C-alpha cells in the first residue's frame, strides 16, 4: 500500500500510538549479557539501552572488548551503519578506537552537548585547531582542520593519528544542530538536506567502513537517520518504489539494536521524510 496513502489513512483516524505499540510488541528480543556485566556498568550512559550480543561492536584488546554500539547490516539496500550512544567522559578513547578500528570516514552526531539543561554526551572532538586532544588509554591524537557553520548543521574536518603506528585519516563530523529539545522538526526538510549532505561526502559508500550514527541513547534521532536513508535507497533500487514497507524495515533493523524510534512522533516524522524525500529520487 502507498505509504503516503497510509499515512492521510492513520493521521485522519489519529493511529499513530496504535501503530507504534505493535512495532514494539513484534520487535526482536536477544540476549545482551555482555553490557548488563557488572565491569561495564559505566560504559552504558542508559541501564535500559543495551547492543545485542551477536551484532555488538568488539573493541581490539584484550583488557576489555566492550562499547555500547551496534552494527546495522541492511542486506538488500546494500548499507551498513554503526548506531552508537553519546560518548561518556569514560569511553571517549574507545569511541575513538572503534571509528578507527573499524575504517569509518564519517561520524554523524544528531544532539547538542546540552539539552534540557543536562549534558547529553562528552565534549569528545576539539573546538580550536591549535587545541588537539590525546587519548592516552587509547594511543590516539585528534585535531580540528577545519569548520563549516550553516544555519541548520555544522561540517568538520578531523585528522586522527594512530600514535602507535603514526599513521593519520580524514574524518569527516557531520553535526545536525537544530532538533528541537521536545517533539520533532516541523518540516523533513532540513533533515533531509543534511542526509543528502552526508551522502554526497562518500561517508555512506561501501570503499569505507560504516558510518558511525549517534544522538543520547544511539536509538530515537539515530533510529531515524538510518530508517529514512535505507527506505529511499530501496525505492531507487526496486522496479515499484510502492513495495517499501517502512514498519518492516524498522522491524528489519530492531533484529540489530533495541528500541530504534522512541516515540510515535518519530514514526510519523519518518513517514514524513520518505514521503517528502522520495519527489527527488523518482526524478525531480
Ligand atoms: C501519541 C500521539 C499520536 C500523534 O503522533 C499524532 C499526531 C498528529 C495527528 C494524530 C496523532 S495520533 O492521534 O495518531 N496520536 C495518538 C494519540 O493522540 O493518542 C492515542
Ligand atoms: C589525514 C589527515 C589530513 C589532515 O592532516 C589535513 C591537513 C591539511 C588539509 C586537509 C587535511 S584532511 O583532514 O583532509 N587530511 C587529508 C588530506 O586531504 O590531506 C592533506
Given amino acids: 500500500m502507498e505509504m503516503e496513502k497510509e499515512f492521510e489513512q492513520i493521521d485522519k483516524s489519529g493511529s499513530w500510538a496504535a501503530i507504534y505499540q505493535d512495532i514494539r510488541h513484534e520487535a526482536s528480543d536477544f540476549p545482551s549479557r555482555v553490557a548488563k556485566l557488572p565491569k561495564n556498568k559505566n560504559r ?14 568488539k573493541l581490539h584488546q584484550e ?7 551496534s552494527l546495522i547490516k541492511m542486506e538488500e539496500a546494500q548499507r551498513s551503519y ?8 569514560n569511553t571517549v578513547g574507545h569511541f575513538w578506537e572503534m ?12 544532539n547538542r552537548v546540552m539539552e534540557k539543561g543536562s549534558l547529553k554526551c562528552a565534549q569528545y572532538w576539539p573546538q580550536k585547531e591549535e587545541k588537539e586532544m590525546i587519548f592516552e588509554d587509547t594511543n590516539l591524537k ?6 563549516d557553520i550553516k544555519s541548520y548543521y555544522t561540517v568538520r574536518q578531523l585528522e586522527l593519528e594512530n600514535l602507535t603506528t603514526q599513521e593519520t585519516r580524514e574524518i569527516l563530523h557531520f553535526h545536525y544542530t537544530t ?3 521536545f517533539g520533532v522538526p516541523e518540516s523533513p526538510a532540513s533533515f533531509l538536506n543534511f542526509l543528502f549532505k552526508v551522502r554526497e561526502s562518500g561517508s555512506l559508500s561501501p570503499e569505507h567502513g560504516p558510518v558511525v550514527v549517534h544522538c543520547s541513547a544511539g536509538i530515537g534521532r539515530s533510529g531515524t537517520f538510518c530508517l529514512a536513508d535505507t527506505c529511499l535507497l530501496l525505492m531507487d533500487k526496486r522496479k515499484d518504489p ?6 518492516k524495515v524498522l522491524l528489519e533493523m530492531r533484529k540489530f539494536r533495541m528500541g530504534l524510534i522512541q516515540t510515535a512522533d518519530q514514526l510519523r516524522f519518518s513517514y514524513l521524510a520518505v514521503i517528502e524525500g522520495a519527489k527527488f529520487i523518482m526524478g525531480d
Fill in 44 to 57: 552504558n550512559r542508559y541501564r535500559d539501552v543495551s547492543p545485542f550480543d551477536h551484532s555488538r561492536i
Fill in 142 to 147: 585528534l585535531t580540528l582542520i577545519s569548520e
Fill in 179 to 181: 532538533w528541537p529539545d
Fill in 242 to 247: 510502492s513495495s517499501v514497507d517502512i514498519k
Fill in 82 to 89: 554503526i548506531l552508537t550512544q553519546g560518548p561518556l567522559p
Fill in 99 to 110: 571509528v578507527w578500528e573499524q575504517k569509518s570516514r564519517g561520524v554523524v552526531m544528531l
Fill in 63 to 69: 583488557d576489555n572488548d566492550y562499547i555500547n554500539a
